């Protein structure tokens, strides 16, 4: 029956929601269900053909004030349901992509639809437009854990050689350790090169 593929798709939605919600990291979101979506869209096209057939046959006039009213209303509701299921799935994966944008890309691509890939590009362009405009003195893409300590120990987890910072350098020797201003290394903690606190 016409609601079923929508239910399969939103059960998929719920499972990917749980997959994302169980962990602190961004779990790489699962494959876009192109096949179920195409089955739904074909089902919607069939329901559209049924409305077309019926609105043709209202010229022929069979009991239309009730019977055609009922057939039309039911198939219309089937289409509303299928729209709701499709938009619920797409809105969840949109929400997760927005989260990933702010977490990393605004500072696994095969699993997205091409609309979702170019959407993620445009949304990263938007985040960068915000932190590049007014309010620029705040790195709007930065962390939301409050700054507890200004100086921190950090252990170098992967090697990256000599890099400059605002008034000096760090030579990121493997398994060396710094005592350093947190604001001068936060980018490297996010990028996974530095370990502690």
């Amino acid at each position: 029956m016409y609601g079923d593929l929508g239910n399969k798709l939103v059960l998929e939605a719920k499972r990917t929601k749980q997959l994302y919600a169980r962990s602190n990291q961004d779990v790489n979101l699962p494959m876009y269900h192109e096949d179920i979506i195409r089955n739904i869209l074909k089902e919607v096209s069939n329901l559209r053909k049924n409305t077309e057939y019926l609105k043709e046959q209202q010229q022929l006039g069979m009991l239309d004030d009730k019977v055609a009213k009922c057939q039309y209303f039911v198939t219309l509701l089937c289409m509303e349901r299928n729209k709701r299921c499709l938009l619920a799935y797409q809105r969840l994966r949109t929400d997760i992509l927005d989260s990933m944008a702010w977490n990393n890309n605004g500072l696994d691509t095969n699993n997205l639809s091409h609309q979702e890939q170019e959407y993620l590009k445009e949304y990263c362009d938007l985040i960068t437009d915000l932190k590049s405009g007014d309010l620029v003195d705040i790195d709007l893409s930065g962390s939301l854990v409050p700054p507890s300590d200004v100086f921190i120990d950090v252990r170098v987890l992967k090697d990256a050689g000599e890099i400059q910072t605002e008034y000096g350098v760090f030579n990121l020797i493997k398994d060396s350790q710094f005592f350093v201003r947190q604001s001068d290394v936060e980018r490297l903690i996010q990028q996974g090169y530095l370990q502690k606190i």
């Binding site: 029956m1 609601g3 929508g6 239910n7 939103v10 059960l11 939605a13 719920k14 929601k17 069979m62 009991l63 009730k66 019977v67 009922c70 057939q71 209303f73 039911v74 509701l77 089937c78 509303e80 349901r81 709701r84 299921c85 938009l87 619920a88 809105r91 969840l92």
Partner: protein
């Protein structure tokens, strides 16, 4: 919410419907597009459809028969022992569906019973959410009997307690 996935799922559950008219062409609800639906046909329809056909008509096109999940058997089981009851086995979305049913047919008795159920289970749920490790079988059994609605409230509550305990004891 329109995009609230647990609401989209809850709307997908099915309720017993009794049709009030002979209507051609709707037989695909009875798995054959080529035949009518007849008056006093008794059929299970999803709530996203049954909700609408029970109001449009005049007599509406459908009457909704009392579902088993709100039968006198289940209501009596609720009214004896709210915390021991396996609502998940009754229906995984029983609270959302009860809210929808109360709204669809204004029913003070069910509103009171479901409020009593929610409050008395909220006590036990908070006890298991507050208790933390330093999973316990007594907790592990209780979380089976929770709805998806209650599982969400439990995860959020328990995560709050766990986060607070973490902050208090780890430097």
């Amino acid at each position: 919410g329109y995009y609230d996935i647990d609401d989209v799922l809850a709307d997908g559950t099915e309720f017993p419907c009794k049709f009030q008219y002979d209507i051609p062409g709707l037989g695909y609800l009875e798995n054959n597009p080529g035949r009518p639906i007849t008056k006093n046909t008794k059929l299970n329809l999803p709530l996203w459809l049954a909700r609408i056909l029970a109001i449009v008509g005049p007599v509406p096109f459908v009457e909704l028969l009392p579902p088993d999940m709100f039968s006198t058997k289940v209501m009596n089981a609720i009214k004896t022992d709210p915390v021991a009851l396996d609502l998940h086995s009754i229906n995984s979305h029983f609270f959302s569906l009860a809210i929808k049913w109360i709204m669809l047919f204004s029913e003070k008795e069910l509103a009171n019973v479901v409020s009593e159920l929610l409050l008395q289970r909220a006590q036990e749920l908070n006890h298991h959410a507050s208790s933390l490790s330093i999973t316990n079988i007594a907790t592990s059994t209780f979380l089976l009997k929770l709805e998806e609605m209650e599982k969400e409230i439990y995860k959020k509550s328990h995560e709050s307690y766990k986060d607070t305990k973490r902050w208090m004891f780890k430097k």
